[PDB]
Amino acid sequence: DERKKELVAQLKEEGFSERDIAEILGKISQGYSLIELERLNNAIIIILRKETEIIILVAKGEKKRILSLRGMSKKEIKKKLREAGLDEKEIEKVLRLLEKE
């Protein structure tokens, strides 16, 4: 679990709180290894992957939402990321990150 330790260390460098790390690491322990993490304005995009199932945790202030991408198209993802509270450009950036993988 040394790689998991590295992920936590990175979260500390990013500036996540104990509870924030616990949430992310919690998902990692559930199999959803942290793949990508980037803050878009006031909403933090946290991308985790378990096998072929990818989830996105969006942390926008006090609003946190998790979107599963399993069986979701880019158009459907856009709609759900809009519900999360992302705009056109922010959603695009997220989709680009997913395309990068």
The amino acid that residue 98 corresponds to is L
Place of tokens 């942390």: 59
Nearest-5° Cα angle at 51, 65 to 29: 60
The dihedral region occupied by 97, where left means phi > 0, alpha psi between -120 and 50, and beta the remainder, is alpha
Place of tokens 């949430």: 23
Per DSSP, the three-state class of 26 is helix
Place of tokens 């990321």: 81
Place of tokens 């072929």: 52
The dihedral region occupied by 36, where left means phi > 0, alpha psi between -120 and 50, and beta the remainder, is beta
d(CA 8, CA 59): 17
Closest CA to 59 of 84, 30, 87: 84
Per DSSP, the three-state class of 17 is coil
Which is it for strands 63-68 and 33-40: parallel, antiparallel or unpaired? unpaired
